[PDB]
Coordinates of C-alpha atoms and ligand atoms in Angstrom, one line a residue:
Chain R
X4 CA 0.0 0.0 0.0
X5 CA 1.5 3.5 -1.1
X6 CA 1.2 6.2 0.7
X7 CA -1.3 9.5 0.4
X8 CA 1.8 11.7 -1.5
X9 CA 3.0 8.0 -3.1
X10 CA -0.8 8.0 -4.6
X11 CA -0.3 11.6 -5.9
X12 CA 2.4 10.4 -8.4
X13 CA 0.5 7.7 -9.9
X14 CA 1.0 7.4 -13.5
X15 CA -3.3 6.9 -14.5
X16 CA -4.1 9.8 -11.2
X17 CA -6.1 12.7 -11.9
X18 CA -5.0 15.9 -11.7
X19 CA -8.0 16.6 -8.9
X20 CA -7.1 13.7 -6.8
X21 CA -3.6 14.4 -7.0
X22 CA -4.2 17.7 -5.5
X23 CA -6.0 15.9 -3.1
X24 CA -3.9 13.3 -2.1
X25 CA -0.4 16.2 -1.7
X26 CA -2.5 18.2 0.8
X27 CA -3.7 15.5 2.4
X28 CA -0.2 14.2 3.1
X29 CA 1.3 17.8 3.5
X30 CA -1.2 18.9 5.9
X31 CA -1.6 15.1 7.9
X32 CA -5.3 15.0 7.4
X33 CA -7.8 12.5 5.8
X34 CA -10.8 14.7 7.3
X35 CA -13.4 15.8 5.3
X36 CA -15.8 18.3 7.1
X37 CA -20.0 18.2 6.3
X38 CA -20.3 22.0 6.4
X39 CA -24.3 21.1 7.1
X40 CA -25.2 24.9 8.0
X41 CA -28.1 26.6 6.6
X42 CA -26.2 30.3 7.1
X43 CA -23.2 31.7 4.8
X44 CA -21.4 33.1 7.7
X45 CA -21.4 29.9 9.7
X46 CA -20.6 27.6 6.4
X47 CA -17.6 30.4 6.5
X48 CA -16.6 30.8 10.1
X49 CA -16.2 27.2 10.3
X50 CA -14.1 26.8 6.9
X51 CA -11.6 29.4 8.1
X52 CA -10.9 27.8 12.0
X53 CA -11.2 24.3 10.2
X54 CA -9.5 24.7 7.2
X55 CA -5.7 23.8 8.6
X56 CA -7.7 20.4 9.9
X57 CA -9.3 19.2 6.8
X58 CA -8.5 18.1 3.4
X59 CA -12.3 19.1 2.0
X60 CA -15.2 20.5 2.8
X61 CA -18.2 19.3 1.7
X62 CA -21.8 21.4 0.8
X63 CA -25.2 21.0 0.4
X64 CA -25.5 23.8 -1.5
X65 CA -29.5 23.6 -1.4
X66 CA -29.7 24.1 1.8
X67 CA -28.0 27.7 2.5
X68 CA -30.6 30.5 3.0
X69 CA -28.4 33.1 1.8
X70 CA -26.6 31.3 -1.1
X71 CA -25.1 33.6 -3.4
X72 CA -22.2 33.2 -5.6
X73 CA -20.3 35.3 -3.6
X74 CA -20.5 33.1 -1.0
X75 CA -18.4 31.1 -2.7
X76 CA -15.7 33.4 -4.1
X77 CA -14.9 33.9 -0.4
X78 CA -15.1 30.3 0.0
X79 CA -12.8 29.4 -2.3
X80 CA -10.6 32.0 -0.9
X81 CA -10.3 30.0 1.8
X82 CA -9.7 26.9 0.6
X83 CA -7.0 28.1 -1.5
X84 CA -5.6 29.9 1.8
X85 CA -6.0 26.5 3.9
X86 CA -5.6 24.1 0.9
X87 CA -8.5 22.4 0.7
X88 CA -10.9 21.0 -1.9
X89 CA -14.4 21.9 -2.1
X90 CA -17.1 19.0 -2.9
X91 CA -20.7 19.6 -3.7
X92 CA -22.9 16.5 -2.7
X93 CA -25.3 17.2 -5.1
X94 CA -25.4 13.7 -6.1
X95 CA -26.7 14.1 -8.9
X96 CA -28.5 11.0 -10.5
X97 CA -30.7 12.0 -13.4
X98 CA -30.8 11.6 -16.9
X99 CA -27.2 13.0 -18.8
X100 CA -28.9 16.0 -20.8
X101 CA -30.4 17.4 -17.3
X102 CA -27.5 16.7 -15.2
X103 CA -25.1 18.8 -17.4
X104 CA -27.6 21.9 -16.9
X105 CA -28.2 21.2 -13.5
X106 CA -24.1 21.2 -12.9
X107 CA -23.1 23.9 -14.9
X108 CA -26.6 26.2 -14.7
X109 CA -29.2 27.6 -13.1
X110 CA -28.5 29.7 -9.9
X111 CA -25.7 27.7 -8.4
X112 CA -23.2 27.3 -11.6
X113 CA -22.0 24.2 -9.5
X114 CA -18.7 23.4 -11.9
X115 CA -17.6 27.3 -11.2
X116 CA -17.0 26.6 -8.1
X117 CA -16.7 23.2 -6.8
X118 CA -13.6 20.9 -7.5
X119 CA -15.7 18.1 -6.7
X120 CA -19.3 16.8 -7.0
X121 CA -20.9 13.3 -6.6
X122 CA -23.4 11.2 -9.0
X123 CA -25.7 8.1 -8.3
X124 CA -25.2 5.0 -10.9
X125 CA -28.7 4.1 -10.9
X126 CA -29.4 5.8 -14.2
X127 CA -26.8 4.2 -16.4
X128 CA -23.4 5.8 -17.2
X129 CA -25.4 9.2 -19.3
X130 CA -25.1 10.4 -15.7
X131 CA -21.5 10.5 -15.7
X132 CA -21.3 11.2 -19.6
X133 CA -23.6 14.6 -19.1
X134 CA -21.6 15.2 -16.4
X135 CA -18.0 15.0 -17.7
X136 CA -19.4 17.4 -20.9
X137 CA -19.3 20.3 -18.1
X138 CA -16.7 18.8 -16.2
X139 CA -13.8 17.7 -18.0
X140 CA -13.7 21.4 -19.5
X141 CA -13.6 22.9 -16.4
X142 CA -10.6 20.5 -14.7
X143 CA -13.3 19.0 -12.4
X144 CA -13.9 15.5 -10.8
X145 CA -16.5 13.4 -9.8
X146 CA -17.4 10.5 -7.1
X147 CA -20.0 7.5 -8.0
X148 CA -21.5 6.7 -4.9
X149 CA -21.0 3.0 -4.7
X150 CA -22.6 2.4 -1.1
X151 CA -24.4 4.2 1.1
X152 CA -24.7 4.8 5.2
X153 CA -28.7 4.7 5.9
X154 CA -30.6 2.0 6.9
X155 CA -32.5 0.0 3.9
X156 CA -29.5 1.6 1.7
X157 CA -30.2 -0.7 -1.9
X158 CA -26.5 0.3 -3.0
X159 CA -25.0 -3.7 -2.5
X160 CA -23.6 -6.3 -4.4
X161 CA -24.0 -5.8 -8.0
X162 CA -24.6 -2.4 -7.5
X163 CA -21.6 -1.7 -5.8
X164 CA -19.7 -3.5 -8.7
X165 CA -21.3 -1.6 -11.3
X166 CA -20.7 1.5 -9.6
X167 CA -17.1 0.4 -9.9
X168 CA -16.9 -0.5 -13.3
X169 CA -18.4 2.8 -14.2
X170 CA -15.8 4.9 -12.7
X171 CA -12.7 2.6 -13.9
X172 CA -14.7 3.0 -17.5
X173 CA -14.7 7.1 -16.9
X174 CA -11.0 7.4 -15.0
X175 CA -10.7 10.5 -17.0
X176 CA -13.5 12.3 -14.9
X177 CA -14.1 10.2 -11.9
X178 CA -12.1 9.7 -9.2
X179 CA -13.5 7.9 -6.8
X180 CA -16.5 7.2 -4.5
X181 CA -18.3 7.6 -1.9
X182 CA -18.3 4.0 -0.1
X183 CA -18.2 2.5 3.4
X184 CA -15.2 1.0 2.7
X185 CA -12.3 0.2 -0.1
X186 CA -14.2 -0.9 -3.2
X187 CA -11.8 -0.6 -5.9
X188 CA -8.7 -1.8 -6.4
X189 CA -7.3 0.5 -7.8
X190 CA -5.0 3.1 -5.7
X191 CA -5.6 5.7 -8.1
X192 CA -9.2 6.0 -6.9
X193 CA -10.2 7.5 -3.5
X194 CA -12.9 6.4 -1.3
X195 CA -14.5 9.0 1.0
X196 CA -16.7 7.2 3.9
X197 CA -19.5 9.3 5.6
X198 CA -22.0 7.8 8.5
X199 CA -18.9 8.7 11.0
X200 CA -18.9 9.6 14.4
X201 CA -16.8 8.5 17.4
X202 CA -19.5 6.9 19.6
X203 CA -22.0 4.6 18.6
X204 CA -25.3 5.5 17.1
X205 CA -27.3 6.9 14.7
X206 CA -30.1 9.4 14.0
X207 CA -33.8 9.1 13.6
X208 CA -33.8 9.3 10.0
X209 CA -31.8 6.1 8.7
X210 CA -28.1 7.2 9.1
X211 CA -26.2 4.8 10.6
X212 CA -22.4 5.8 12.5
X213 CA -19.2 3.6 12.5
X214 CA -15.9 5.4 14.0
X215 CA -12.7 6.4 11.7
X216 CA -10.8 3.6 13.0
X217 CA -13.5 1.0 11.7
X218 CA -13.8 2.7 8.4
X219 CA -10.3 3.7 7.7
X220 CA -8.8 1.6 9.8
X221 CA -10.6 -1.9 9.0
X222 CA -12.7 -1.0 5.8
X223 CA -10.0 0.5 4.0
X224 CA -11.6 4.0 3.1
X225 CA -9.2 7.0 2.5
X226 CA -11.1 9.8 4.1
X227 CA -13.8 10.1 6.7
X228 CA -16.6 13.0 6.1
X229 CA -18.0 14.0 9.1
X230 CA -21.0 16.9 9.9
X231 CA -23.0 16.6 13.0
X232 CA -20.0 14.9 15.4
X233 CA -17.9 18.2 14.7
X234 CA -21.0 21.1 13.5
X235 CA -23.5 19.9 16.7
X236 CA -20.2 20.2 19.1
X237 CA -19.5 22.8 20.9
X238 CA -15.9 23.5 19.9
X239 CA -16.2 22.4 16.2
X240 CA -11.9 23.2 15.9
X241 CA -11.0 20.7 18.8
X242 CA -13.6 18.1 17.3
X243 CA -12.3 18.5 14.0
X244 CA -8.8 18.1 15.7
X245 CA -10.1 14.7 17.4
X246 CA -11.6 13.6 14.1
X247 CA -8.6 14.4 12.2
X248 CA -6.4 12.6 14.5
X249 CA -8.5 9.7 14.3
X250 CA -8.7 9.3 10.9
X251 CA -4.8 10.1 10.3
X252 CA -3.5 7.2 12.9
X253 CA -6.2 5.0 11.5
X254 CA -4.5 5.8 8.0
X255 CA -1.0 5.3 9.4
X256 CA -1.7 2.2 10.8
X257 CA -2.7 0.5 8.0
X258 CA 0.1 1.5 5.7
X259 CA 2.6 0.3 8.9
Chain T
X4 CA -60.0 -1.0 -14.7
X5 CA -61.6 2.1 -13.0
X6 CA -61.1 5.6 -15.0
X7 CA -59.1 8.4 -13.6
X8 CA -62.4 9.6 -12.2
X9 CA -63.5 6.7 -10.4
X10 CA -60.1 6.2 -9.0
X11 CA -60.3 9.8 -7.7
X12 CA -63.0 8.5 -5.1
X13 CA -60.5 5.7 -4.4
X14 CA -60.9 5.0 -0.3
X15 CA -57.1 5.1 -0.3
X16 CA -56.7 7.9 -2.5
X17 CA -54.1 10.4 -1.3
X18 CA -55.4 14.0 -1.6
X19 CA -52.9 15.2 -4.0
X20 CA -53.6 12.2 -6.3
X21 CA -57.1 13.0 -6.5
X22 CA -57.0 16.6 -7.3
X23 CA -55.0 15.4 -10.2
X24 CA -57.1 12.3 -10.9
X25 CA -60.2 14.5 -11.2
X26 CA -58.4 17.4 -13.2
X27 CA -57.2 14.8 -15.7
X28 CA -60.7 13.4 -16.5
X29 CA -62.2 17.2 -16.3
X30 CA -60.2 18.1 -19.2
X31 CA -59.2 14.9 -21.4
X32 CA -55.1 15.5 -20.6
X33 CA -52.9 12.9 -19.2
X34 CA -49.7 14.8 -20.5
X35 CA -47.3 15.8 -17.9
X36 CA -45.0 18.7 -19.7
X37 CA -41.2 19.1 -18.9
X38 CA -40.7 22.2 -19.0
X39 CA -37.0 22.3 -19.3
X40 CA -36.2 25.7 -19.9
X41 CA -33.6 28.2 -18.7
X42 CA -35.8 31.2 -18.8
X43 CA -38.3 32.4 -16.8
X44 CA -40.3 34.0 -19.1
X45 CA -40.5 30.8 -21.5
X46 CA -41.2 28.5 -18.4
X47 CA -44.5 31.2 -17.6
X48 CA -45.2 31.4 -21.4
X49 CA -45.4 27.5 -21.8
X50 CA -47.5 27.5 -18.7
X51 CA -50.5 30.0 -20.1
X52 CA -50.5 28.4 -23.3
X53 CA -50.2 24.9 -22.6
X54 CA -52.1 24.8 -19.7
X55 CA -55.3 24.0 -21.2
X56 CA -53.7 21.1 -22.5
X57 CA -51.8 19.6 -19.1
X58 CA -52.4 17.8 -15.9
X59 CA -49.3 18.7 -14.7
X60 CA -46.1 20.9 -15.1
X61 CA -43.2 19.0 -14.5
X62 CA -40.0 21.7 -13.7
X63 CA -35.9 21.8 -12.7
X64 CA -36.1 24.5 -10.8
X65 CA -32.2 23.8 -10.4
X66 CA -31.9 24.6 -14.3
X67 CA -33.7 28.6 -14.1
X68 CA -30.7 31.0 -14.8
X69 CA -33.5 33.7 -12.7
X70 CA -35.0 31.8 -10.4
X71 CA -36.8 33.4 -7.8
X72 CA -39.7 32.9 -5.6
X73 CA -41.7 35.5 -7.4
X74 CA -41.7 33.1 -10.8
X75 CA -43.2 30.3 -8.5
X76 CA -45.7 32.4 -7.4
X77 CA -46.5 33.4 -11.7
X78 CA -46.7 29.5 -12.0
X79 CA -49.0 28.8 -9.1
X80 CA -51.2 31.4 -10.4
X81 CA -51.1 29.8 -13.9
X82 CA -51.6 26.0 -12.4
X83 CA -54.6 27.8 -10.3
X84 CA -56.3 28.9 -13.2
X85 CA -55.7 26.4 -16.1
X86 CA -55.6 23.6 -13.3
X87 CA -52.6 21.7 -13.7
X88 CA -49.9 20.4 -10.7
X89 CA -46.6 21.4 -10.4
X90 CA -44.1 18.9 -10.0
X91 CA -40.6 19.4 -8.9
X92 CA -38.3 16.3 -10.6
X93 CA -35.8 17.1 -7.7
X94 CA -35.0 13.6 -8.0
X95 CA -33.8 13.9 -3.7
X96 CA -31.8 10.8 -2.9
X97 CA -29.7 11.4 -0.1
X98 CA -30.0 10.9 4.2
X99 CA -33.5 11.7 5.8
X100 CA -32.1 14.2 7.7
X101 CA -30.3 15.9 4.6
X102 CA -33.4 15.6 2.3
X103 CA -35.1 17.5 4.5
X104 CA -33.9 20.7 4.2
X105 CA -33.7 20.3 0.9
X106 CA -36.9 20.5 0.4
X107 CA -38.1 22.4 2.9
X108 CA -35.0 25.5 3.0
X109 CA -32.8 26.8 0.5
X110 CA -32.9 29.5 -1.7
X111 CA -35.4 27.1 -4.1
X112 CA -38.2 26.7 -0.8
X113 CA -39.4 23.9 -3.0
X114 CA -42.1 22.1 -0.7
X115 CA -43.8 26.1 -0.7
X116 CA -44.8 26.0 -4.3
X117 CA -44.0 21.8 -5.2
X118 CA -47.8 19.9 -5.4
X119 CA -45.6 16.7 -6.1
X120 CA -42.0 16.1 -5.6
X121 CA -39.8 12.7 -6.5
X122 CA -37.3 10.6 -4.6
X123 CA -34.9 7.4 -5.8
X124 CA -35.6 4.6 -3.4
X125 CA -31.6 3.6 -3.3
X126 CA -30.8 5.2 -0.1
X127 CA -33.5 3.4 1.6
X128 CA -36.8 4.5 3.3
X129 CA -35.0 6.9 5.6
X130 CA -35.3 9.0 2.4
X131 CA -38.8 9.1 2.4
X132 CA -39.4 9.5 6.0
X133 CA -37.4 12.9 6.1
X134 CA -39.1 14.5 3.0
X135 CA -42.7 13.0 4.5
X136 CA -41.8 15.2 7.8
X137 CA -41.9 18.3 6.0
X138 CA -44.4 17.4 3.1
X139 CA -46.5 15.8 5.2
X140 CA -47.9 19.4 7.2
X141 CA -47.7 21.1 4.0
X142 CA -50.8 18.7 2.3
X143 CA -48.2 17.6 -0.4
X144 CA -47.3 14.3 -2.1
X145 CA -44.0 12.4 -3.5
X146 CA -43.3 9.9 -6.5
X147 CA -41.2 6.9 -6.2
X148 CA -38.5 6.3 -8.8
X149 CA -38.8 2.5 -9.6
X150 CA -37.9 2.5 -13.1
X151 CA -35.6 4.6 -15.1
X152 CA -35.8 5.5 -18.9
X153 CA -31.9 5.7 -19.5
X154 CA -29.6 3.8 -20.8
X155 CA -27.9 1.4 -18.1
X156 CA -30.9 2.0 -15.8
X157 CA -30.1 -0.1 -12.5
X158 CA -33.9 0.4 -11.4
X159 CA -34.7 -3.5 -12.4
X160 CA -36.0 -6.0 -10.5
X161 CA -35.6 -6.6 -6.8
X162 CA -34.8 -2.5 -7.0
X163 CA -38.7 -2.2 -8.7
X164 CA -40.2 -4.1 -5.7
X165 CA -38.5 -2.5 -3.5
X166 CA -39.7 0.9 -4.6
X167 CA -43.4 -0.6 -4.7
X168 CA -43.1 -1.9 -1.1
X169 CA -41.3 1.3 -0.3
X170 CA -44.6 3.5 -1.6
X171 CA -46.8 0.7 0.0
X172 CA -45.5 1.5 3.3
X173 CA -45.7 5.4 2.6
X174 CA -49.3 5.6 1.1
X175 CA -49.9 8.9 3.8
X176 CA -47.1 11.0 1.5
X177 CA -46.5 8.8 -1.5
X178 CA -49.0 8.8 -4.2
X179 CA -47.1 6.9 -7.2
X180 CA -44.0 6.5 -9.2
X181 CA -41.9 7.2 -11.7
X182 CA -41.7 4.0 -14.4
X183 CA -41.7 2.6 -17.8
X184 CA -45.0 1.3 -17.0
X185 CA -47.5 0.0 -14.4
X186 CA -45.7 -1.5 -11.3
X187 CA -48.2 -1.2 -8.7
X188 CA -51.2 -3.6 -8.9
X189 CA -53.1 -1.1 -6.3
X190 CA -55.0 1.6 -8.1
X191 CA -54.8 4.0 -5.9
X192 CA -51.0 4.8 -7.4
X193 CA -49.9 7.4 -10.3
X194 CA -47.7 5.7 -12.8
X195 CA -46.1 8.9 -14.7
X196 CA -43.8 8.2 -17.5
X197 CA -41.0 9.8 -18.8
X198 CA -38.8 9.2 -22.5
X199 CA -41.9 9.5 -24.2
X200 CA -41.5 10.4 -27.7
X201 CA -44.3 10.2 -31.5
X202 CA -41.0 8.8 -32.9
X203 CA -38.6 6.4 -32.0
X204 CA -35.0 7.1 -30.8
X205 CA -33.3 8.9 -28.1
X206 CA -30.2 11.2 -27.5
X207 CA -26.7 11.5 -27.2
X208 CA -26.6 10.6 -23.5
X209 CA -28.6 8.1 -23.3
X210 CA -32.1 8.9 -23.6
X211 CA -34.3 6.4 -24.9
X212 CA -38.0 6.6 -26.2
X213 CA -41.3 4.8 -26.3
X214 CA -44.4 6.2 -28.3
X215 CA -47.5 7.2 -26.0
X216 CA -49.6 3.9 -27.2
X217 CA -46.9 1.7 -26.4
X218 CA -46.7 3.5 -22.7
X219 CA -49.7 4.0 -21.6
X220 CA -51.8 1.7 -23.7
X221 CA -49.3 -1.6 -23.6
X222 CA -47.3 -0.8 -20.6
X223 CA -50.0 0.1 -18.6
X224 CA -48.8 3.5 -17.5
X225 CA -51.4 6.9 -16.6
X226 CA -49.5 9.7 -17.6
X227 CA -46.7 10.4 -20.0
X228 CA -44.1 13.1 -19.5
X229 CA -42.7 14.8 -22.5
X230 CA -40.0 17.8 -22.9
X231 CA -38.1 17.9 -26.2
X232 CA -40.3 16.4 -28.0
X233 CA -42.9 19.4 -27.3
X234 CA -40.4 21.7 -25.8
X235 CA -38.0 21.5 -29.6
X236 CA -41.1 21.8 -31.4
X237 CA -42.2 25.3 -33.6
X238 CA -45.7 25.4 -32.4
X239 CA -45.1 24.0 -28.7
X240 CA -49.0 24.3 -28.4
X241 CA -49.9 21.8 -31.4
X242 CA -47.1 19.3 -30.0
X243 CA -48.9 19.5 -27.0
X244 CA -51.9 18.5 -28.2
X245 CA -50.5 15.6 -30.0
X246 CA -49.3 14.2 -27.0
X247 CA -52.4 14.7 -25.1
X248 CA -54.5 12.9 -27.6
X249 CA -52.3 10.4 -28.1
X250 CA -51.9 9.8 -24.5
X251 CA -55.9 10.1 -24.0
X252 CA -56.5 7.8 -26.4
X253 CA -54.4 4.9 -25.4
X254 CA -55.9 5.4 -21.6
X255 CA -59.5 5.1 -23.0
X256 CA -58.5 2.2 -25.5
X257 CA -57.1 0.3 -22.3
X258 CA -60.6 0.7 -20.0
X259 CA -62.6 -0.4 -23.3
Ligands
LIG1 O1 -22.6 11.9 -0.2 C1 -22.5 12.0 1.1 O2 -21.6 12.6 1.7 C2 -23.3 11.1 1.9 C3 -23.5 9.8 1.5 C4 -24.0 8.8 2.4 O3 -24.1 7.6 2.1 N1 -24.4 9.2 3.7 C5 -24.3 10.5 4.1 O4 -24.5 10.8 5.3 N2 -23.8 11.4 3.2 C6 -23.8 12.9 3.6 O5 -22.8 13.1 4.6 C7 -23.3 13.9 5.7 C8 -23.4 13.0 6.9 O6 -23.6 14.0 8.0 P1 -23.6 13.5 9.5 O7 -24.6 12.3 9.7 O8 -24.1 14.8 10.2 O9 -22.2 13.2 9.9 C9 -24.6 14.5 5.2 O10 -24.4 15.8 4.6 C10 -25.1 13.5 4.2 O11 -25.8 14.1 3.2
LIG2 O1 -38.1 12.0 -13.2 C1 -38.3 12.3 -14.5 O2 -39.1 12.9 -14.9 C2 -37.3 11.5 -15.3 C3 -37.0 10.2 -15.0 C4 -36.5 9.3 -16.0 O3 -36.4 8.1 -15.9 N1 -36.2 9.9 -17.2 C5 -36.4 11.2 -17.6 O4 -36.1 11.6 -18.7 N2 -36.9 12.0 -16.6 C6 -37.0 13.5 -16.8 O5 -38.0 13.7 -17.8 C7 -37.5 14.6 -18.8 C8 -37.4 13.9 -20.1 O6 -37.3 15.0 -21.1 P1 -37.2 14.6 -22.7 O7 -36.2 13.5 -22.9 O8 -36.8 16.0 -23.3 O9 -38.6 14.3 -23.1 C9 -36.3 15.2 -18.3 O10 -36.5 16.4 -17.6 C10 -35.7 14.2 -17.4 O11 -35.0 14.8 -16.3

């Protein structure tokens, strides 16, 4: 097993995850943060104190009050100054000719702004072609969500392969997935595993938590994402901190 | 096999269903439009004219370069008068707990001005439990995605029954599906159908079609959901009316 800035080199890497992979190494995190605020200046404060601890921070886009696309020149501000990617979980999963206007388009210009976004598999590989049509122009990448956290989650088996397949079919835009666990092969590809938190539970809606050491640590996966066991803490900087360390030992362990 | 009318009276019947149930055999139109515009103006425009002609307005409101909450308010007024739904093919398929402020928050405030959204079934039922706690209050109603009309499509078999059951075990909030054809046996569930075409082919990114008969007359299905092939069209009006006789016909050749 090669190492995060090892990874970086490979000869088949993209450009995205390569970025990805140095800062991750550089900066000794493998912490993605769920920036789950509904407020700008929150989604901000916390991407400034947090930046130095993560290697990404992840939107929801749809669910800021005061989105405007300012907002995100002074994110990306910030993750420039930190060095850190930004990843829209938009997961998108419709036909190809609507996903390209719903990623470039529309009021949120997605690809302008985000390095990253996610797609479902369920409709057929026209997601990821529509997709690529904005994306590859823009330097962008994309994650196929090959398995999911919630409870009653249908994303098993031959779905999981499939979702496979289809990114090792489309290595020049997608770089990896969202999984509970190392799925591919293929150490070009990163695997970013959310449903984490240090203590056992859950929530009341389906998600379902597992700690970094199970999913790094035993499962294999490169990066935790984590929202409500940092944003619904009081001190979201020293929980990042805890996270991060978790992950990163976790990480280390396994390459020994 | 009961009409649209009849089935409007169904016991069962959710409220949402109904009103469209009963609007459909009012005016002769099972045609769904998909409005898949970027303006505003053409979005309103398509609504006055073809109103007359629709059950329902299907829209991306993630696709509107000036979106705003005013233009939703111009489309309610227009579904108000010409009596049609508005459906908002939001396609949510993430965490309960995420999908709910999707819906509810944002800058789009979809469940406000939304009769109908949709869901994908993959992330389990947590998905429709979290959009049910805010569409639920707000008298609304959701479609299931059990089948898909892209190429690749992973919505087969045990994934169609489990989107049935799913919407089974919803009936309060879910009032049909999205399919190729009839997959409920319980008539008190919409079957809308999308990549529905006078011609045969598809697109680039794989789209494929099916004529009207062959969906709603030999697949069973209620209503058929057409962009392009209206939306491309000169006289946008005259295409509509195609499609809704086509689509009228083939129901009433069915109850015989
Ligand atoms: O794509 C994701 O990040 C995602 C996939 C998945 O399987 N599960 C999952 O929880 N997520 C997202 O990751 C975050 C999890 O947040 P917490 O449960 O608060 O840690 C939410 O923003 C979810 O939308
Ligand atoms: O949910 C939908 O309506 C949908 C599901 C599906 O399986 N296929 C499908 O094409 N759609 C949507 O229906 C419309 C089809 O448009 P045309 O191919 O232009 O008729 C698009 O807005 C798609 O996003």
């Amino acid at each position: 097993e090669l190492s995060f800035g090892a990874r970086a080199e490979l000869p088949r890497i993209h450009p995205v995850a390569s970025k990805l992979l140095r800062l991750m190494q550089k900066k000794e995190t493998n912490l993605c943060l769920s920036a789950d605020v509904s407020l700008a200046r929150e989604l901000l404060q916390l991407a400034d104190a947090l930046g130095p601890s993560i290697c990404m921070l992840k939107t929801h886009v749809d669910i800021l009050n005061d989105f405007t696309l300012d907002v995100m020149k002074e994110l990306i501000t910030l993750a420039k100054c930190h060095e850190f990617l930004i990843f829209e979980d938009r997961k998108f999963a419709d036909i190809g000719n609507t996903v390209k206007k719903q990623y470039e388009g529309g009021i949120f210009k997605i690809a302008s702004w985000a390095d990253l976004v996610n797609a479902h598999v369920v409709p057929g590989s026209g997601v990821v072609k529509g997709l690529q049509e904005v994306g590859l122009p823009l330097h962008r990448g994309c994650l196929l969500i090959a398995e999911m956290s919630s409870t009653g989650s249908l994303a098993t088996g031959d779905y999981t392969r499939a979702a496979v397949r289809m990114a090792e079919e489309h290595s020049e835009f997608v770089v990896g997935f969202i999984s509970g666990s190392r799925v591919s092969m293929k150490p070009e590809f990163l695997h970013l595993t959310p449903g984490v938190q240090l203590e056992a539970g859950g929530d009341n809606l389906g998600q379902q938590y597992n700690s970094p050491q199970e999913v790094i640590g035993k499962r294999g996966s490169d990066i935790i994402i984590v929202g409500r066991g940092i944003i619904s803490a009081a001190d979201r900087l020293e929980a990042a901190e805890m996270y991060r360390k978790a992950a990163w030992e976790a990480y280390l362990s396994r390459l020994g």
